PDB file of C-alpha atoms and ligand atoms in Angstrom:
ATOM      1  CA  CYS A   4       0.000   0.000   0.000  1.00 34.32           C
ATOM      2  CA  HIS A   5       0.997   3.592  -0.731  1.00 32.09           C
ATOM      3  CA  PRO A   6      -0.531   6.890   0.455  1.00 31.67           C
ATOM      4  CA  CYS A   7      -0.722   8.120  -3.146  1.00 32.26           C
ATOM      5  CA  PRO A   8      -0.902   6.460  -6.594  1.00 32.11           C
ATOM      6  CA  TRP A   9       2.132   6.324  -8.869  1.00 30.17           C
ATOM      7  CA  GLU A  10       3.034   9.724 -10.319  1.00 29.79           C
ATOM      8  CA  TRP A  11       0.796  11.592  -7.888  1.00 28.51           C
ATOM      9  CA  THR A  12       1.994  14.151  -5.328  1.00 29.25           C
ATOM     10  CA  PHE A  13       1.246  14.055  -1.591  1.00 27.89           C
ATOM     11  CA  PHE A  14       0.572  17.138   0.522  1.00 26.93           C
ATOM     12  CA  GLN A  15      -1.314  17.308   3.842  1.00 25.92           C
ATOM     13  CA  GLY A  16      -3.360  14.119   3.572  1.00 28.21           C
ATOM     14  CA  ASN A  17      -4.295  14.574  -0.071  1.00 28.73           C
ATOM     15  CA  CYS A  18      -2.902  13.350  -3.382  1.00 26.51           C
ATOM     16  CA  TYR A  19      -2.593  15.583  -6.417  1.00 25.83           C
ATOM     17  CA  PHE A  20      -2.278  14.567 -10.040  1.00 26.19           C
ATOM     18  CA  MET A  21      -0.412  17.070 -12.210  1.00 22.70           C
ATOM     19  CA  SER A  22      -1.353  16.088 -15.753  1.00 18.36           C
ATOM     20  CA  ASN A  23       1.205  15.696 -18.522  1.00 21.17           C
ATOM     21  CA  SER A  24      -1.466  16.109 -21.199  1.00 18.51           C
ATOM     22  CA  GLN A  25      -4.027  18.856 -21.870  1.00 17.48           C
ATOM     23  CA  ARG A  26      -7.840  19.201 -21.772  1.00 14.92           C
ATOM     24  CA  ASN A  27     -10.397  21.996 -21.756  1.00 12.73           C
ATOM     25  CA  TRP A  28     -11.930  22.805 -18.371  1.00 13.38           C
ATOM     26  CA  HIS A  29     -15.056  20.650 -18.649  1.00 15.94           C
ATOM     27  CA  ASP A  30     -13.091  17.631 -19.850  1.00 14.32           C
ATOM     28  CA  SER A  31     -10.618  18.174 -16.995  1.00 17.41           C
ATOM     29  CA  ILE A  32     -13.512  17.823 -14.550  1.00 17.19           C
ATOM     30  CA  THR A  33     -14.394  14.507 -16.182  1.00 19.98           C
ATOM     31  CA  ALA A  34     -10.798  13.276 -16.252  1.00 22.03           C
ATOM     32  CA  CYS A  35     -10.564  13.730 -12.503  1.00 24.75           C
ATOM     33  CA  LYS A  36     -13.879  12.008 -11.827  1.00 22.13           C
ATOM     34  CA  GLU A  37     -12.669   9.063 -13.925  1.00 19.48           C
ATOM     35  CA  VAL A  38      -9.809   8.489 -11.480  1.00 19.99           C
ATOM     36  CA  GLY A  39     -11.893   8.980  -8.341  1.00 19.98           C
ATOM     37  CA  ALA A  40     -10.824  12.591  -7.846  1.00 22.47           C
ATOM     38  CA  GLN A  41     -11.944  16.170  -8.398  1.00 22.78           C
ATOM     39  CA  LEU A  42     -10.483  19.094 -10.382  1.00 20.36           C
ATOM     40  CA  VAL A  43      -8.581  20.757  -7.540  1.00 23.89           C
ATOM     41  CA  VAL A  44     -10.544  22.779  -5.006  1.00 26.66           C
ATOM     42  CA  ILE A  45      -8.200  24.745  -2.750  1.00 24.64           C
ATOM     43  CA  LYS A  46      -9.610  24.564   0.788  1.00 23.86           C
ATOM     44  CA  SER A  47      -6.730  26.288   2.581  1.00 20.57           C
ATOM     45  CA  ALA A  48      -3.942  28.847   2.241  1.00 22.26           C
ATOM     46  CA  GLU A  49      -1.097  26.386   2.796  1.00 24.74           C
ATOM     47  CA  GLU A  50      -2.471  24.348  -0.103  1.00 22.92           C
ATOM     48  CA  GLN A  51      -2.458  27.350  -2.449  1.00 19.24           C
ATOM     49  CA  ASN A  52       1.194  28.190  -1.792  1.00 17.82           C
ATOM     50  CA  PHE A  53       2.190  24.575  -2.359  1.00 16.70           C
ATOM     51  CA  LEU A  54       0.277  24.206  -5.617  1.00 19.80           C
ATOM     52  CA  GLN A  55       1.351  27.588  -6.996  1.00 20.60           C
ATOM     53  CA  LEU A  56       5.002  26.660  -6.511  1.00 21.61           C
ATOM     54  CA  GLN A  57       4.668  23.347  -8.350  1.00 22.96           C
ATOM     55  CA  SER A  58       2.686  24.957 -11.176  1.00 22.13           C
ATOM     56  CA  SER A  59       5.107  27.867 -11.536  1.00 24.31           C
ATOM     57  CA  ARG A  60       8.062  25.481 -11.771  1.00 26.56           C
ATOM     58  CA  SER A  61       6.243  23.298 -14.311  1.00 23.71           C
ATOM     59  CA  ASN A  62       5.903  26.475 -16.368  1.00 23.47           C
ATOM     60  CA  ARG A  63       2.547  25.190 -17.626  1.00 20.68           C
ATOM     61  CA  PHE A  64      -0.862  26.884 -17.677  1.00 23.05           C
ATOM     62  CA  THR A  65      -2.969  24.635 -15.441  1.00 24.62           C
ATOM     63  CA  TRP A  66      -6.703  24.462 -14.677  1.00 26.33           C
ATOM     64  CA  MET A  67      -8.110  24.469 -11.156  1.00 25.10           C
ATOM     65  CA  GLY A  68     -11.704  23.690 -10.154  1.00 26.22           C
ATOM     66  CA  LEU A  69     -12.931  27.283 -10.055  1.00 28.50           C
ATOM     67  CA  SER A  70     -15.267  29.140 -12.422  1.00 25.76           C
ATOM     68  CA  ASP A  71     -17.704  32.034 -12.760  1.00 25.13           C
ATOM     69  CA  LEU A  72     -19.711  30.329 -15.520  1.00 25.67           C
ATOM     70  CA  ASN A  73     -23.032  30.385 -13.666  1.00 27.43           C
ATOM     71  CA  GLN A  74     -22.831  34.053 -12.676  1.00 27.72           C
ATOM     72  CA  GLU A  75     -20.202  36.371 -14.168  1.00 23.46           C
ATOM     73  CA  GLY A  76     -18.008  37.754 -11.401  1.00 24.29           C
ATOM     74  CA  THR A  77     -19.026  35.241  -8.749  1.00 22.43           C
ATOM     75  CA  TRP A  78     -16.317  32.580  -8.595  1.00 22.10           C
ATOM     76  CA  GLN A  79     -17.368  29.180  -7.291  1.00 21.72           C
ATOM     77  CA  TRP A  80     -15.472  25.939  -6.743  1.00 20.59           C
ATOM     78  CA  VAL A  81     -16.691  22.784  -8.498  1.00 24.45           C
ATOM     79  CA  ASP A  82     -17.860  21.274  -5.215  1.00 21.37           C
ATOM     80  CA  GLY A  83     -20.353  24.129  -4.991  1.00 19.50           C
ATOM     81  CA  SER A  84     -18.306  26.067  -2.439  1.00 21.90           C
ATOM     82  CA  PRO A  85     -17.910  29.861  -2.871  1.00 23.46           C
ATOM     83  CA  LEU A  86     -14.568  31.633  -3.322  1.00 23.04           C
ATOM     84  CA  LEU A  87     -13.480  33.390  -0.115  1.00 25.87           C
ATOM     85  CA  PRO A  88     -12.338  37.044   0.165  1.00 23.75           C
ATOM     86  CA  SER A  89      -9.013  35.891   1.632  1.00 25.64           C
ATOM     87  CA  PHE A  90      -8.324  33.760  -1.456  1.00 28.24           C
ATOM     88  CA  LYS A  91      -8.911  36.693  -3.805  1.00 28.60           C
ATOM     89  CA  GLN A  92      -5.373  37.913  -3.119  1.00 30.86           C
ATOM     90  CA  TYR A  93      -4.143  35.142  -5.430  1.00 33.62           C
ATOM     91  CA  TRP A  94      -5.262  36.593  -8.785  1.00 32.49           C
ATOM     92  CA  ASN A  95      -2.478  37.999 -10.990  1.00 32.29           C
ATOM     93  CA  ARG A  96      -2.398  41.771 -11.471  1.00 31.86           C
ATOM     94  CA  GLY A  97      -5.275  42.875 -13.676  1.00 31.68           C
ATOM     95  CA  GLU A  98      -7.175  39.629 -13.109  1.00 33.60           C
ATOM     96  CA  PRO A  99      -9.820  38.438 -13.372  1.00 35.77           C
ATOM     97  CA  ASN A 100     -10.529  40.548 -16.468  1.00 36.48           C
ATOM     98  CA  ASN A 101     -12.979  38.344 -18.393  1.00 37.71           C
ATOM     99  CA  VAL A 102     -11.317  39.444 -21.638  1.00 38.56           C
ATOM    100  CA  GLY A 103     -13.220  37.785 -24.463  1.00 40.60           C
ATOM    101  CA  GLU A 104     -15.349  35.943 -21.897  1.00 38.18           C
ATOM    102  CA  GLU A 105     -13.136  33.979 -19.500  1.00 37.52           C
ATOM    103  CA  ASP A 106     -15.012  31.870 -16.979  1.00 36.69           C
ATOM    104  CA  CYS A 107     -12.468  29.284 -15.826  1.00 37.44           C
ATOM    105  CA  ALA A 108      -9.467  29.746 -13.495  1.00 36.07           C
ATOM    106  CA  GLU A 109      -5.891  28.574 -14.126  1.00 36.68           C
ATOM    107  CA  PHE A 110      -2.563  28.764 -12.315  1.00 38.22           C
ATOM    108  CA  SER A 111      -0.490  31.266 -14.284  1.00 36.49           C
ATOM    109  CA  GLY A 112       3.019  32.293 -13.338  1.00 34.96           C
ATOM    110  CA  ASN A 113       2.911  33.162  -9.647  1.00 36.11           C
ATOM    111  CA  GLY A 114      -0.837  33.619  -9.363  1.00 31.87           C
ATOM    112  CA  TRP A 115      -4.225  32.953 -10.935  1.00 32.47           C
ATOM    113  CA  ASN A 116      -5.752  34.032 -14.211  1.00 34.78           C
ATOM    114  CA  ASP A 117      -9.173  33.607 -15.742  1.00 36.38           C
ATOM    115  CA  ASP A 118      -9.125  32.242 -19.298  1.00 37.47           C
ATOM    116  CA  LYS A 119     -11.449  30.738 -21.920  1.00 39.00           C
ATOM    117  CA  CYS A 120     -12.925  27.450 -20.692  1.00 41.01           C
ATOM    118  CA  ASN A 121     -12.633  25.839 -24.128  1.00 41.10           C
ATOM    119  CA  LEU A 122      -8.847  26.207 -24.159  1.00 38.02           C
ATOM    120  CA  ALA A 123      -6.866  23.044 -23.553  1.00 37.85           C
ATOM    121  CA  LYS A 124      -4.497  23.281 -20.591  1.00 39.02           C
ATOM    122  CA  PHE A 125      -2.890  20.958 -18.097  1.00 39.22           C
ATOM    123  CA  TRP A 126      -4.928  20.237 -14.979  1.00 38.60           C
ATOM    124  CA  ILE A 127      -4.625  19.084 -11.392  1.00 39.33           C
ATOM    125  CA  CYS A 128      -6.824  16.469  -9.705  1.00 37.43           C
ATOM    126  CA  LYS A 129      -7.120  16.086  -5.954  1.00 38.08           C
ATOM    127  CA  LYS A 130      -8.245  13.147  -3.811  1.00 36.90           C
ATOM    128  CA  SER A 131      -7.578  12.064  -0.242  1.00 39.07           C
ATOM    129  CA  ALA A 132      -4.392  10.146   0.578  1.00 40.15           C
ATOM    130  CA  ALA A 133      -4.666   6.635   2.005  1.00 39.85           C
ATOM    131  CA  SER A 134      -3.156   5.824   5.396  1.00 40.64           C
ATOM    132  CA  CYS A 135      -1.248   2.567   5.863  1.00 40.20           C
TER     133      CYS A 135
HETATM  134  O1  LIG B   1       5.290  37.892 -15.978  1.00 39.56           O
HETATM  135  C1  LIG B   1       5.316  37.460 -17.332  1.00 39.56           C
HETATM  136  C2  LIG B   1       4.172  36.510 -17.637  1.00 39.56           C
HETATM  137  O2  LIG B   1       4.757  35.287 -18.149  1.00 39.56           O
HETATM  138  C3  LIG B   1       3.830  34.253 -18.511  1.00 39.56           C
HETATM  139  O3  LIG B   1       3.171  34.465 -19.739  1.00 39.56           O
HETATM  140  C4  LIG B   1       2.506  35.740 -19.841  1.00 39.56           C
HETATM  141  C5  LIG B   1       1.265  35.648 -20.716  1.00 39.56           C
HETATM  142  O4  LIG B   1       0.902  34.255 -20.859  1.00 39.56           O
HETATM  143  C6  LIG B   1      -0.232  34.022 -21.702  1.00 39.56           C
HETATM  144  O5  LIG B   1       0.002  34.379 -23.034  1.00 39.56           O
HETATM  145  C7  LIG B   1       0.868  33.439 -23.701  1.00 39.56           C
HETATM  146  C8  LIG B   1       0.893  33.728 -25.192  1.00 39.56           C
HETATM  147  O6  LIG B   1      -0.461  33.602 -25.680  1.00 39.56           O
HETATM  148  C9  LIG B   1      -0.543  33.724 -27.108  1.00 39.56           C
HETATM  149  O7  LIG B   1       0.260  32.744 -27.670  1.00 39.56           O
HETATM  150  C10 LIG B   1      -0.055  35.110 -27.554  1.00 39.56           C
HETATM  151  O8  LIG B   1      -0.935  36.111 -27.061  1.00 39.56           O
HETATM  152  C11 LIG B   1       1.365  35.366 -27.037  1.00 39.56           C
HETATM  153  O9  LIG B   1       1.741  36.706 -27.320  1.00 39.56           O
HETATM  154  C12 LIG B   1       1.445  35.119 -25.527  1.00 39.56           C
HETATM  155  O10 LIG B   1       2.796  35.211 -25.099  1.00 39.56           O
HETATM  156  C13 LIG B   1      -1.463  34.774 -21.172  1.00 39.56           C
HETATM  157  O11 LIG B   1      -1.898  34.187 -19.956  1.00 39.56           O
HETATM  158  C14 LIG B   1      -1.145  36.263 -20.950  1.00 39.56           C
HETATM  159  O12 LIG B   1      -2.248  36.901 -20.280  1.00 39.56           O
HETATM  160  C15 LIG B   1      -3.081  37.701 -21.073  1.00 39.56           C
HETATM  161  O13 LIG B   1      -3.860  36.933 -21.986  1.00 39.56           O
HETATM  162  C16 LIG B   1      -4.760  35.989 -21.356  1.00 39.56           C
HETATM  163  C17 LIG B   1      -5.461  35.226 -22.461  1.00 39.56           C
HETATM  164  O14 LIG B   1      -6.258  36.088 -23.261  1.00 39.56           O
HETATM  165  C18 LIG B   1      -5.732  36.728 -20.427  1.00 39.56           C
HETATM  166  O15 LIG B   1      -6.545  35.791 -19.735  1.00 39.56           O
HETATM  167  C19 LIG B   1      -4.950  37.566 -19.422  1.00 39.56           C
HETATM  168  O16 LIG B   1      -5.851  38.312 -18.618  1.00 39.56           O
HETATM  169  C20 LIG B   1      -4.010  38.514 -20.166  1.00 39.56           C
HETATM  170  O17 LIG B   1      -4.776  39.410 -20.957  1.00 39.56           O
HETATM  171  C21 LIG B   1       0.107  36.418 -20.095  1.00 39.56           C
HETATM  172  O18 LIG B   1       0.449  37.791 -19.988  1.00 39.56           O
HETATM  173  C22 LIG B   1       2.842  33.934 -17.374  1.00 39.56           C
HETATM  174  O19 LIG B   1       3.518  33.235 -16.340  1.00 39.56           O
HETATM  175  C23 LIG B   1       2.209  35.207 -16.801  1.00 39.56           C
HETATM  176  O20 LIG B   1       1.434  34.885 -15.655  1.00 39.56           O
HETATM  177  C24 LIG B   1       3.294  36.211 -16.419  1.00 39.56           C
HETATM  178  O21 LIG B   1       2.687  37.410 -15.957  1.00 39.56           O
HETATM  179 CA1   CA B   2     -19.096  34.828 -18.389  1.00 37.99          CA
HETATM  180 CA1   CA B   3     -15.830  35.470 -16.325  1.00 38.86          CA
HETATM  181 CA1   CA B   4      -7.705  36.861 -17.708  1.00 36.70          CA
END
């Protein structure tokens, strides 16, 4: 037994899958469900710092489970949870700008950016880590 599956990353009781292939946002949601996970929902500040560092180093635009598709301007996580005011400090400068209609969030550089949901990007899945 292993806390996390092969190629996954462990951090604070959860396993994260950093994809090596690309998908649009909706298909990323499905990809995660197919492996018993969810497109990453950041539930804490320590988690954000950890993920941002890995994403920045990967130098890849990467989807997270956050969108304002249902109501422009109101960002909600895929589990139905609302984005908190304390997490809003993570957007890059000038973001979110909804330029050309951007309703999905991605890790970009050292922060977050909103981009077109139909764009294919890497993604991160999250599921709980097993204890053995
Ligand atoms: O600090 C520097 C900067 O470095 C990284 O890249 C910056 C740049 O990345 C994205 O554009 C990439 C290319 O996209 C097309 O191929 C061309 O436009 C080409 O000229 C670009 O280089 C993109 O995220 C961009 O952000 C702007 O566009 C997006 C998409 O329309 C929009 O959502 C943003 O609000 C903004 O207008 C970004 O500047 C990244 O690590 C950056 O985070 C970093 O700041
Ligand atoms: Ca919109
Ligand atoms: Ca939007
Ligand atoms: Ca943007």
